[PDB]
């Protein structure tokens, strides 16, 4: 499964993470 989780704490809630989840 594609991993959309933030790589580290400073990417929690990041636009990239949110977008990643949005297109799964």
């Amino acid at each position, epitope marked *: 499964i594609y991993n959309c989780e933030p790589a580290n704490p*400073s990417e*929690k809630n*990041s636009p*990239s993470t949110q977008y990643c989840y949005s297109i799964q």
Partner: antibody
Amino acid sequence: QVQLVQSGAEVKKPGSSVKVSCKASGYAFSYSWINWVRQAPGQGLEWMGRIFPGDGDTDYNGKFKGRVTITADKSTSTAYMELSSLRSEDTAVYYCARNVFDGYWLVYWGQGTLVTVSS
Amino acid sequence: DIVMTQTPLSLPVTPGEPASISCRSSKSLLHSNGITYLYWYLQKPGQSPQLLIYQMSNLVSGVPDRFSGSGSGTDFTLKISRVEAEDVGVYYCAQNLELPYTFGGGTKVEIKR
């Protein structure tokens, strides 16, 4: 233009609690983590905690044994750090800093607030 | 917690010559994604900290090209190819791989004369 403007220097008595402000502008206040980092003399930089103002989510450094409270006021785009039961070793310059997503981390810093603990 | 340690404590530098400062972490800052979560900040005299290098080797746009960063997962170097007077201040390395975020003790760069 991203700006983080903090409250002025504060003298606090031992055992008291200080509230330091960080007024943000030039970006979406709700959607970046605001971090608090202090610089005590003879010490480097030490992380205190952070808040995501959009949902109020926080993380704290365990080292401060629950003495730190970080909050946000969306009406004024202001983040706050409160530190209770102040001791002389809490004398430090307290900075707020905005995390910039996509790997940059702490790009934007406030000017710092000197808190001096003394009787 | 991840402990960040720097050397030397103090570094007199000569404008026009190279300078290097070192950092190490108690745990590897290498993520499976290939990125190393090591950052370099500089606090110039009377100023707030600024970010110079993110993720070990990436220069923030606007930072002079004389600065560079490299290292392994646990040991890091900030290099100034040719020092300028405006490069003085306290340099801090830091990690954001894990909470709590942690910083090195700092290296204070001053002018050698």
